Design an enzyme around this catalytic site. Structure first.
Site, PDB file in Angstrom:
ATOM      1  N   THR A  46      31.308  26.247 -37.069  1.00  0.00           N
ATOM      2  CA  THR A  46      29.865  26.159 -37.290  1.00  0.00           C
ATOM      3  C   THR A  46      29.131  25.923 -35.980  1.00  0.00           C
ATOM      4  OG1 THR A  46      30.249  25.125 -39.467  1.00  0.00           O
ATOM      5  CG2 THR A  46      28.032  24.925 -38.542  1.00  0.00           C
ATOM      6  N   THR A  47      29.667  25.002 -35.184  1.00  0.00           N
ATOM      7  CA  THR A  47      29.090  24.665 -33.886  1.00  0.00           C
ATOM      8  C   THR A  47      29.179  25.853 -32.928  1.00  0.00           C
ATOM      9  OG1 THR A  47      29.733  22.324 -34.211  1.00  0.00           O
ATOM     10  CG2 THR A  47      29.056  22.966 -31.979  1.00  0.00           C
ATOM     11  N   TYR A 110      27.070  29.341 -50.222  1.00  0.00           N
ATOM     12  CA  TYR A 110      26.104  30.184 -50.920  1.00  0.00           C
ATOM     13  C   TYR A 110      26.474  30.631 -52.350  1.00  0.00           C
ATOM     14  CZ  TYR A 110      22.917  34.058 -51.933  1.00  0.00           C
ATOM     15  OH  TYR A 110      22.017  34.910 -52.532  1.00  0.00           O
ATOM     16  N   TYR A 136      37.703  22.416 -45.035  1.00  0.00           N
ATOM     17  CA  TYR A 136      36.458  21.988 -44.426  1.00  0.00           C
ATOM     18  C   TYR A 136      35.406  21.818 -45.523  1.00  0.00           C
ATOM     19  CZ  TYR A 136      32.360  22.083 -41.249  1.00  0.00           C
ATOM     20  OH  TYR A 136      31.191  21.794 -40.591  1.00  0.00           O
ATOM     21  N   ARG A 141      25.825  22.188 -46.206  1.00  0.00           N
ATOM     22  CA  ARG A 141      25.662  23.568 -45.730  1.00  0.00           C
ATOM     23  C   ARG A 141      26.077  24.613 -46.758  1.00  0.00           C
ATOM     24  NH1 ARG A 141      24.736  24.572 -40.238  1.00  0.00           N
ATOM     25  NH2 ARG A 141      24.894  22.729 -38.871  1.00  0.00           N
ATOM     26  N   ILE A 206      36.856  16.424 -35.467  1.00  0.00           N
ATOM     27  CA  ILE A 206      36.429  17.704 -34.939  1.00  0.00           C
ATOM     28  C   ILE A 206      34.975  17.505 -34.571  1.00  0.00           C
ATOM     29  CG2 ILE A 206      35.962  20.110 -35.419  1.00  0.00           C
ATOM     30  CD1 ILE A 206      38.420  20.054 -37.257  1.00  0.00           C
TER      31      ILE A 206
END
Lengths: 297, 297, 298, 295
Positions: A46-47, A110, A136, A141, A206
């Protein structure tokens, strides 16, 4: 036992230069992590703006991390998730052939699968490669939560699923997971609460913050693993400020901004729909940074 | 520099018989807590059904706790809060008059005061007595939250305000509090995450579970206070199932149910609007209890 | 069923304080102003009336003033009489009836989070204690509990007195749910910004904060909607949006009392702790928004 | 130019792991024959996440061909959390003959309001057809603020409204009180009537896959200001509207279509899968209450 990837890990930013991934910079940043005691790096999470990267760009980043970490103890835990199971299986397989040591697979975003769907999603992924798979969970999100039951069932039914990166701000869940499945590797995906997760038996982080402060995050993690809770707590407290401000706008907008302010990257570019922070937030970010010792190259 | 009440504390249930407070049972239950290593008891808190007790009953319960604890090291931290400041002030002064060593004062419920009102609310309470005052933050019940800033200002500005009972399931806030003000006594008001709060520098617990298992809760807390984190975690892990089930319905419905099933109280009697748990939850509570050694009288 | 009801445009009355005490002459003046502007009922000592910080005696006084002031008018008194202790709530209910209230509004038990079962017994006990209409009040953001649709409907059907619910939950889905399964109940809006959507779905009244300041507009909205003149009711609802939001920039009733003070309708801006004056900035914001509205005089 | 009225978010039927193209067209034809004003190929209900780009294009084209010669318009799903991809999808939809596009807010990566703004402006500048914003915070993890919706509506000519699936009637009042010119579209079946009665001009419906005649009648009664008849239908439909969400959409709607004999197999693409046996039985039960139009 399961094969695992633990300790202090960095969710790597992906630097751009005129729209393209900056490959020299990327390698230079990874090398800086390694030299500051980091145990693993996560390309294209994501980062790392995985959402806006192409498949080819994933491959490129994974390859660079693999190459750079070659001949060292540092592992590559590759981002390889998707909300379509066929895609996720494909990305895992690719990460595997590119030489990743493991994969980090985000819960389907989503489309809100049921717990049963999540179970099959991850089972398919795990059976497609022979490398460690880290779950994860980041419901803020994705819009779904992998329940403790589902996580434990996946750990128990699939040999290479070894744990979960938890980014949900829910320490009760962490207790729940490790009370019922003590073989699980719980990994902090929330910098502000790295210490509380580690002191409850979590085995790594992480980290977003470790992009900027790899030495402090590795020291925190290693202290905690050494059962030096005093020193680990001290580092966690002094990092609280930056750990929060790095989310004053959606990650990785603040961390990339801070990396740029620190001269660690040449240009502050994002791929839409991400963009530069407000000039106000730019100032807020610059303010918090200057309160920490930042390692160069 | 402050006077404090810390360590392992019990949020006492209030046993009823024929619609009245069972005064003999109450004293007997407190003696059981004393003999099992508890450092303080909290009469007429949420777990004691404070909302449904009359003023005379409030008094009766505090006096009994004060009298039963006299000559022992065990302190009385009396429940004495309200969502009207003139009432809260009155209760505070009454509690002290009854001989309480300190007070536990819940954030105003229902009327949603602003942070400025909370500050003034608590300042007024703190100035009305000369005994320790512990703040009580429980947003899920009150509909409001004492912010970290308000908590820290009150601690610094008011001599007798010495910490906060945090019941918000937000380990991030706990890090936030102790990072910016390491001198305050952070008390766990959430049983399942007792260990995490203590391991981050929390200094005690106000426990629902200790009604049933006072020996295990006091041992957990004392181990954590002695920095024996491995043994504290061990106990916190074992307690997770009962800690969880004790909140399957609103506290104190399950804890009273467990106390009745354990034979520690005569009748499973609540005052409306509280009532017996669902028959499904009753079964769950009865099953979970089998895994623990419950101390008798 | 066929029950006794209290519906229409209703005002959750503010409680003006002067020198730390209830300003009784002012309370009466505000009620006359509501009556003369088309309001169908007033709710003394609700949340907007700072119920939590009134004494039992002041609670009596407010109801009596409301009852006397409405005497000889068509306007009804729906007294606040909620509590999170059932024995207390029963007492407040009998209290209100004895002092001449036409009905009671009874908030869901705050803080102690009863189960749906406890809620049922709580309200059943209250309903059986008096012979005047009982309106339920769901405000989860304040109480920490919600009366489910099932429980509301069971109460409506099992208890003669209970005729509806004041819903302050911002959940229009629940309103659909309620009136789909039980079209006989009176659903009352307790959320000003969305009075119109609630009314257009078959809601039968409002208990308004905004009506304290603009009783003519809220009452016009309600009656247009009750007469199925939905386009007119919508117009007013849209016009009122600005003030409807700003009245909650800080917890009700801090903004409404501030606005009443700014309109020159009350003598002093006093609250009982833990409520207090708004920040200077919100004071300015309330003042600015008010300038877009015609505010009726005394 | 706009696309409003009663619209259907089309399910995507699978057969042996592939899009059943004959079944797809026949379903669209059924929607057309029951008063639907527009169809939305490959939105969330169409399992857009799990379709390849070629399958995307195929569904859009089938919708366009099937609607040809009728008054029914094709509002194509073309959202993405990557602006370069969203633009590409939009441009493809346009060249396939879509009448407009429905573009979901970037999910997962949580853009700032400024980022959403640039994201949608780029999409809107890429095509000359109408663009409908799609706000569903529960799925995306972000919300297009009312200010951002209004700026985009005002600044981009072909951005004409928003599909709102946030379960928040207050936001709907806010939107239409400050910018009445925009087309507010219900994306939440249970509250279709309240949104329409407040000045919404259409629905993009899950339920209409199953009951297209009732959803279109509801919408048309509301648009004609016959609120009494619109409410009556909204009330009748409440049970089915809720049960269609007992598990994440489109799991229930597809199950119902299957049980109704409207599609050949109850087949999803992972991570979606069949409902639990409990929910399956609940769905079967609620269905018995409604007349389900045939082909």
């Amino acid at each position: 036992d399961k094969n695992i990837i633990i300790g202090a890990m960095t969710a790597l930013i992906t630097p751009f230069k005129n729209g393209k991934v900056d490959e020299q910079s990327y390698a230079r940043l990874i090398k800086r992590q390694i030299e500051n005691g980091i145990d693993a790096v996560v390309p294209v999470g994501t980062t790392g703006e995985s959402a806006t990267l192409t498949h080819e760009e994933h491959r490129t980043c994974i390859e660079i991390a693999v190459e750079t970490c070659k001949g060292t103890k540092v592992k590559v835990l590759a981002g390889a998730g998707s909300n379509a199971t066929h895609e996720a299986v494909g990305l895992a397989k690719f990460a595997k052939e590119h030489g990743a040591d493991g994969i980090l697979s985000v819960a389907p975003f989503y489309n809100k699968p049921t717990q049963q769907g999540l179970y099959e999603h991850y089972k398919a992924i795990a059976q497609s490669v022979d490398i460690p798979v880290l779950l994860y969970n980041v419901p803020g999100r994705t819009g779904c939560e992998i329940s403790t039951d589902t996580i434990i069932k996946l750990f128990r039914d699939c040999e290479n699923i070894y744990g979960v990166k938890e980014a949900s701000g829910n320490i009760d869940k962490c207790v729940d997971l490790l009370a019922h499945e003590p073989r699980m590797m719980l990994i902090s995906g929330e910098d502000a609460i790295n210490y509380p997760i580690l002191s409850n038996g979590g085995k790594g982080v992480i980290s977003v913050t470790s992009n900027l402060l790899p030495d402090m995050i590795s020291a925190l993690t290693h202290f905690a693993l050494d059962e030096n809770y005093k020193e680990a707590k001290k580092i966690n407290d002094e990092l609280y400020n930056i750990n929060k401000i790095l989310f004053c706008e959606s990650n990785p907008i603040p961390i990339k901004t801070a990396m740029y302010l620190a001269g660690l990257i040449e240009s502050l570019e994002f791929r839409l729909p991400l963009c530069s922070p407000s000039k106000e937030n730019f100032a807020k970010i610059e303010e918090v940074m200057k309160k920490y010792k930042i390692k160069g190259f």
